[PDB]
């Protein structure tokens, strides 16, 4: 079974930087994987970030985001935040190759900006 695990709460930096590790468990040992940071609010959902990367090799970046890949976790750093950006941020890992395709959606991270 596919499980994605992100922290419950992160407070944001005085400058506007929130950082959180996003760990996943593949039943396979997949190589091409695609991470998406999502924002939830009511039934709606909005794209914040999206990255595709291959294995151990570096993360490729939506400009608002940066990160690192250190094994089977991804250190997603969001910046350029306003007080208005406080909400629920979902980690979405997709394992793309080799087969089978697996989809993983997290429980969400509450980011606070004050």
């Amino acid at each position, epitope marked *: *079974a*596919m*499980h994605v695990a992100q922290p419950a709460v992160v407070l944001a930096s005085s400058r506007g930087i929130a950082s959180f590790v996003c760990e996943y468990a593949s039943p396979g040992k997949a190589t*091409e994987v*695609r991470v998406t940071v*999502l924002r939830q609010a009511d*039934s709606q*959902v909005t*794209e914040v970030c*999206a990255a*595709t990367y291959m294995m151990g090799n570096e993360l490729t970046f939506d400009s608002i985001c940066t990160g690192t890949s250190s094994g089977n976790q991804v250190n997603l750093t969001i910046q350029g935040l306003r007080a208005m950006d406080t909400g629920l941020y979902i980690c*979405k890992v997709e394992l*793309m*190759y080799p*087969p*089978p*395709y*697996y*989809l*993983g*959606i997290g429980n969400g991270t509450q980011i606070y900006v004050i």
Partner: antibody
Amino acid sequence: QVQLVESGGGVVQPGRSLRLSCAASGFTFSSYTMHWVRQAPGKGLEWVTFISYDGNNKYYADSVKGRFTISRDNSKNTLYLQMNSLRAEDTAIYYCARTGWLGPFDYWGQGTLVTVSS
Amino acid sequence: EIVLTQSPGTLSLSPGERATLSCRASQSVGSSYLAWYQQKPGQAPRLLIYGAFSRATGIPDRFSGSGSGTDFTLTISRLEPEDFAVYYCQQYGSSPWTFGQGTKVEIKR
């Protein structure tokens, strides 16, 4: 305004090929991943094929593997299905569908009947 | 290949009555990456429920989803005349995407 209009169904003799098209509207198509799903007359829903956001990754149902290709012209906002060595059992209504943000098939095409007989 | 078996084939319920549709999987289904669809014949499927229990935009209150692991239920709390249709459960957490054979729901007279 979300719309998926598919076209170019019809009749094919067995062995010969046929390419289906689905044209997307009022969402930034580039951003959402796509599928095809057929429905044999009076039978259930069968997933046929999946295409990545870019097209760098493609997945096919066992029963079409080797014979069908999925592709996308992003700037034309169009999804395609090349079908190659059509069998009589490939006769179905072919649905184009969009994968939701969080995984389900949220929007569907209208349907396009492909008949494979000599 | 995660197989999905829905039961029964046919629910025979009068309008107003509750309808309870079952979907059971060959193995456990992710973190509830399981959908429900509706199909009124000669029309495309329409998404009803995703994430086992969350309702699709513009689907009315009467539709209701439950379950976890290999067991999932769709509840229609009262059958209105537009609800008499064919329903498919689907898993979408891993490839191949698979549907169940569908439960048809007919008018009982």
